[PDB]
C-alpha cells in the first residue's frame, strides 16, 4: 500500500485530544482540522470540553503534528516524522517557563483509519497563581521560531529543542524552553536525519460563530538546514 511520505501527498484529516492537569486544575480539549504537507500548511480548531481553559491557549500551540512540515525535495531523506507512518511515533516534551512552572507532555501521533490522531497527556506543576500563565497575561498571538532537529543515536529517534517567545500584555516577552524527544512506535526502519531545522510560523484566530472557549490555529512549517 502507501507507506511513509506517500500518505501526506494530499489533505489528511487530523484529530487532537488532550487531558491536562496544571497545578491541580483539570481539563480536556478536543481538536479537528486537516494538514497538507505539500504546502506545509496546518489548520486546527480546538475546544475546551470541560468548560474553560485554566491556562492561556498560546502555551499549548506546540503541544497540540510535525509530520506535516514541507520537507523540500532535496531533504526528503531527513523527514523522520513521515517515515514512521502509518505506525506512528511518540512525542515527549518538557517545557520550561522562565521563573515559572513547567509542562510535561507525552503524546502518540499515528494514523487510525483515515485520520492522523495526536493524543496527548499534559501535566503542569510549580506555577505562580499570579504569574503570567495562570494570571492569563499572555497576548493571544504567536511568533515564528526555528525548531532544531538532531539524530538521537542512543535511541532510534531524534532530539528536538527550541525556545518559544510568548508575548505579554505589558509588552515584555516570556521565554518557554522546549526540549523534545521522538521515537517510533513500529519496528520498521526509519530515517535518522542530519542536523537541520524547521522554519515555523503560527497565527491564532477566533471563530466569531463560536460560543465556547476555543482557539483556531493555522501553522506553516518548512524544513531547512542543508545545502544541495
Amino acid at each position, epitope marked *: *500500500a*502507501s507507506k511513509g511520505e506517500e*500518505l501526506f501527498t494530499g489533505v489528511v484529516p487530523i*484529530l487532537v485530544e488532550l487531558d491536562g492537569d496544571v497545578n491541580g486544575h483539570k481539563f480536556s480539549v478536543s481538536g479537528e482540522g486537516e494538514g497538507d504537507a505539500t504546502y506545509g500548511k496546518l489548520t486546527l480548531k480546538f475546544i475546551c470540553t470541560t468548560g474553560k481553559l485554566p491556562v492561556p491557549w498560546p502555551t499549548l500551540v506546540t503541544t497540540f503534528v510535525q509530520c506535516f512540515a514541507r520537507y523540500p525535495d532535496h531533504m526528503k531523506q531527513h523527514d523522520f516524522f513521515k517515515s514512521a*507512518m*502509518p*505506525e*506512528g511515533y*511518540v512525542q515527549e516534551r518538557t517545557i520550561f517557563f522562565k521563573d515559572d512552572g513547567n509542562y510535561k507532555t507525552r503524546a*502518540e501521533v*499515528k*494514523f*487510525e*483509519g*483515515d*485520520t492522523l*490522531v495526536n*493524543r496527548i497527556e499534559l501535566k503542569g506543576i510549580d506555577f505562580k497563581e499570579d504569574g503570567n500563565i495562570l494570571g492569563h497575561k499572555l497576548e493571544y498571538n504567536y511568533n515564528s521560531h526555528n525548531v532544531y532537529i538532531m539524530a538521537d543515536k542512543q535511541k532510534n529517534g531524534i532530539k528536538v529543542n527550541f525556545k518559544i517567545r510568548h508575548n505579554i500584555e505589558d509588552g515584555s516577552v516570556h521565554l518557554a524552553d522546549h526540549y523534545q524527544q521522538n521515537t517510533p*512506535i*513500529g519496528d520498521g526502519p526509519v530515517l535518522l536525519p542530519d542536523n537541520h531545522y524547521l522554519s515555523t510560523q503560527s497565527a491564532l484566530s477566533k471563530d466569531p460563530n463560536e460560543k465556547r472557549d476555543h482557539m483556531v490555529l493555522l501553522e506553516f512549517v518548512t524544513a531547512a538546514g542543508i545545502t544541495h
Partner: nanobody
Amino acid sequence: DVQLVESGGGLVQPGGSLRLSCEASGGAFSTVAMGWFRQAPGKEREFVGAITWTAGSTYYADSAKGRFTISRDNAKNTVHLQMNSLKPEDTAVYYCAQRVRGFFGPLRTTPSWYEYWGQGTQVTVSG
C-alpha cells in the same frame, strides 16, 4: 511488557448467551483496535469481530453479524463481546487480540494485524 486477560467464557445450553471480556494492562502505547478470534481443536483460526478504539466502528464476521455485539468500557482498556443465540458449532477457544500501532485503511481481519494475543478462553455449547 503487556498482558491481555480474558474472562467470562463458560458453558451454555443452545440458544443462550455468553459474554467474553478482555482487558489490556501495562504496555507502552495506547490501544488502536481490539478483536476476538476463535479456534476449535484441529481446525483453523477464525476471525469473530473487532472494534476501533477511537472511532468505535465495529466489524463482524459473517457467522456473527446480528447475534454478536462488541463494545468498549469507558475507554477503560476493556472490551466485551456479547454473544446471543449461541449454537453448538460456535464451540471453540476464543482469543482476544490487540493492535497498538497505527494503521491506514480499513480494519483488517488477519491475525498478523494484531500484535498482542490473550491466552484463550473456553466457550462450550451443549445440550
